Subunit: 203 residues, 2 copies
Amino acid sequence: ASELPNGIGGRVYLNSTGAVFTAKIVLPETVKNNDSVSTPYIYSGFRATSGTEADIGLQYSKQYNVWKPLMKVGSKNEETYIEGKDKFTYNKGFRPGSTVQMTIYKNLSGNTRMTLWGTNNDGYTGRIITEIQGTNIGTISKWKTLATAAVSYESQRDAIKATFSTSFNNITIDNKAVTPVVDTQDFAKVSVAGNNVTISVNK
Amino acid sequence: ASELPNGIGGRVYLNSTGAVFTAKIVLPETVKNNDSVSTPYIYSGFRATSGTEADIGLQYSKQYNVWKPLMKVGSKNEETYIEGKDKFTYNKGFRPGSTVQMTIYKNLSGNTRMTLWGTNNDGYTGRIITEIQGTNIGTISKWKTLATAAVSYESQRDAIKATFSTSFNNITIDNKAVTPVVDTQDFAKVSVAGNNVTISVNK
């Protein structure tokens, strides 16, 4: 598609039906987001064969200049922090320009889990484990990867101002390397090189 | 419900299945929205018996300190301006503290229309007619009225900072006065007095 439905950005699809996704995310060094409507998001996720859509990754906090966990699975968006709440949420999060190791489990005892390893704004290197409980995800159609500047409503599209670039590297699903396929490029440049993708958002 | 799904605010329901809604909206004199996540929205709308949900009203522009049209009917969110684009959109809109006369037509030749009469930030008094074309709305279950501070993602709820109060007065559906029923009050105080409702958002 020419446009992303809830804002601007780049999207790739990962043609795998696997259960465990891993990638190394290189966070932007700088974020320009001189608007009063959008939020930068960087995330993976999947479409279940049932139709359930999951967005799982990080959101940029303008207030704290860090990246924090982002997770939504269908209608369920209440996150449970299993570990690391005090190190990577509230006034803390993954620091700009750092690398974050991400693992996504579509279904671990009926819960969708995202584990993130990296460094926070205080220089602490550790882990934050987040879940959406009781999602009970069955088979998967495909996985996705996006970098976006999202808005609550459509008309707000023209007002979006966002400039940031990110990489998803060494993408593996069920321990197999997966090469993403370029999808939408809406005020974004998407570059794929094997199981690696760089998405540069610029509006 | 104790919480609104996409943010904070107050909600009332209008137990009418009628086709044409009218109300006089008194816009807030002041808007405090000292956050980097939410947008203030004031709107009416309906739930069709098909399940289709419509949100039809105004959004606050922090950039220009005005209220502008906001309309969405199910999956259709591309607004067509029939009249008044140059007077009440982009760097112009309904001025703070002013009164706006609103008429909503669920189905006018297959289109959902909102007509707004009021005064813009340049002191021009006029009309803006906006439509979502090809909605072809059939029977209605009920209408609604809300004043909210909405966010794109759930975790941003706690960070919302919004203080603004608005009134929907002389509410009529198919020329009959309708008394709203208080629903959710989530960091908002809702007061109903006959076919009039005041919603004071404060977080």
